[PDB]
Design a protein around this ligand. Structure first.
Ligand SMILES: Cc1cc2nc3c(=O)[nH]c(=O)nc-3n(C[C@H](O)[C@H](O)[C@H](O)COP(=O)(O)OP(=O)(O)OC[C@H]3O[C@@H](n4cnc5c(N)ncnc54)[C@H](O)[C@@H]3O)c2cc1C
Ligand SMILES: O=C(O)c1nc2ccc(C(F)(F)F)cc2nc1NCc1ccc(C(F)(F)F)cc1
Ligand SMILES: C[C@H](CO)OC[C@@H](C)OC[C@@H](C)O
Length: 448
């Protein structure tokens, strides 16, 4: 069914009207692309997954949007080769659940499991294990791409079509529609983590902990940090680090089903704050609560600690998500940018801190080794012009923004942040001379 629909990214801003094709028939999808290609110039087409990108990369005002979520077959899982063969519309939660009984683990998980394989590839997503596992694109062994000429090209990371493979990774759907892919999974003997927790008192402590060599001992690592408090409390963090557990590390209670996968506003409607919360006893409690060694945790506990806070309303509309990475060596610059945020009069509570490891060969891939930050600002007067200033500082400090989080940076800024963009554009124009694939983001960021 083709239907005119008003679409936004997860941020609920920059809405646009598109014809949304929603069909489980792959032949039908090929036809829609064949059609647009024969128009000989229109507003093009773009794939859309579960719409978890905050910005405008999965919409196409006055053009076609192809919803890929019906194409959601897991074709095979093989424990011996560790390979999964899945439709692009398969989501990571579905995949995780299907693969666990084989002793296989999704090699890269984002902070939400409601993302499609196509969206994971097109945004080259990263997770808590980036420093040890790279991003999603690193684990794709092949994918089938529906190109503008209406052909399906079988792409591999090292084969004859390697250039197009690596332009599609992180390509935000602008090389064509990923129909199907083979992913190499991580072997695992349990669905649990062994975790170590640390709590730092300041930005300086947070940085030292990430720079002291301890990161090499954990496959998974991420932190919450304070973005509101004045120094020295600015940049103090709760750090969660771990690795997948082996069967013997589990307590007997859980050894029987090692691979099995199994809130607070309902218990405490008054809130969590008491008379002690912000004084010295509170500080002591938080420090001890966030400090531990060898704690066995399931996925929700280790990986989705946002889940227990239920209704606590800070992620829908009226918030601007901002994510950037600063190269590792630029520690002084990084610290400066954190100070700029604190003094801005814009207050973010939901803050992510993570040290990225080595980048991959995708020219538009977001992650580079360095200090990754997410912040979430309430929309209020002055914010648009302030984040523009942030863009300037991110750029001048060698860093970049993430397309999966952006709806408002300029083409000029984006291009300077991605010095391989011309290289990428040359590939896209080779594979899509007629701009059959197009999106609001493509036009805004001049990637069309
Ligand atoms: C709560 C939350 C937490 C998050 N945490 C993280 C995180 O930790 N790390 C991280 O990297 N990201 C994170 N994200 C961002 C998210 O992982 C990406 O935006 C991801 O691309 C969303 O997948 P999707 O299927 O919803 O794709 P959509 O947002 O629907 O589309 C995103 C892009 O993928 C393209 N696309 C989708 N399907 C296909 C296809 N079949 N072929 C070609 N192109 C396609 C679209 O054209 C678009 O350019 C988070 C998002 C949310 C809401
Ligand atoms: O909501 C999001 O967009 C989000 N983005 C993330 C980007 C990177 C990473 C990284 F890999 F680095 F750990 C994690 C991300 N997590 C996201 N959301 C889940 C989430 C956000 C904030 C918090 C915290 F504030 F710390 F409690 C806890 C969980
Ligand atoms: C951001 C990252 C989740 O991938 O870490 C959150 C952990 C440290 O929880 C922090 C608590 C206090 O909110």
């Amino acid at each position: 069914t083709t239907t005119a629909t008003r679409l936004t990214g997860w941020g609920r801003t920059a809405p646009s009207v598109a014809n949304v094709l929603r069909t489980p028939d792959a032949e039908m999808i090929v036809k829609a692309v064949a059609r647009v290609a024969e128009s000989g110039g229109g507003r093009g087409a773009i794939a859309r997954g579960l719409g978890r990108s905050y910005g405008d990369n999965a919409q196409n005002g006055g053009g076609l949007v192809i919803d890929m979520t019906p194409l959601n077959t897991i074709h095979s899982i093989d424990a011996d080769t560790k390979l999964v063969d899945i439709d692009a519309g398969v989501n990571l939660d579905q995949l995780m659940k299907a693969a666990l009984p084989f002793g296989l683990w999704v090699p890269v998980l984002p902070g939400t499991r409601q993302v499609t394989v196509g969206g994971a590839i097109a945004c080259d997503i990263h997770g808590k294990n980036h420093h040890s596992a790279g991003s999603f694109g690193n684990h794709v062994r092949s994918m089938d791409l529906l190109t503008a000429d209406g052909e399906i090209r079988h792409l591999t990371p090292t084969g004859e079509d390697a250039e197009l493979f690596w332009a599609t990774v992180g390509g935000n759907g602008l090389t064509g529609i990923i129909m199907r892919a083979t992913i190499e999974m991580t072997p695992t003997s349990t669905a649990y983590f062994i975790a170590d927790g640390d709590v730092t008192a300041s930005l300086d402590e947070t940085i030292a902990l990430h720079s002291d060599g301890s990161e090499a001992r954990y496959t998974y690592s991420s932190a919450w940090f304070d973005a509101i408090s004045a120094p020295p409390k600015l940049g103090r963090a709760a750090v969660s680090r771990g690795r997948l557990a082996t069967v013997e590390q589990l307590p007997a209670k859980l050894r029987s089903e090692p691979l099995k996968f199994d809130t607070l506003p309902d218990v405490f409607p008054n809130g969590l704050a008491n008379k002690y919360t912000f004084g010295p006893i509170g500080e002591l409690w938080y420090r001890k609560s966030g400090t531990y060694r060898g704690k066995v945790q399931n996925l929700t506990q280790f990986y989705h600690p946002l889940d227990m806070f239920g209704e606590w309303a800070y992620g829908p509309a009226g918030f601007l998500q901002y994510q950037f990475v600063i190269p590792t060596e630029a520690v002084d610059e990084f610290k400066k940018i954190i100070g700029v945020i604190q003094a801005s009069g814009h207050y973010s509570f939901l803050n992510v801190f993570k040290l990225f490891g080595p980048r991959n060969q995708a020219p538009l891939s977001f992650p580079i080794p360095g200090w990754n930050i997410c912040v979430d600002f309430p929309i209020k007067d002055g914010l648009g012009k302030f984040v523009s200033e942030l863009d300037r500082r991110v750029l001048e400090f060698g860093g970049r923004l993430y397309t999966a989080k952006d709806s408002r940076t300029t083409a000029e800024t984006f291009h300077a942040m991605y010095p391989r963009v011309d290289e990428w554009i040359s590939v896209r124009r080779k594979v899509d001379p007629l701009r059959v694939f197009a999106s609001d983001m493509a036009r805004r960021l001049e990637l069309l």
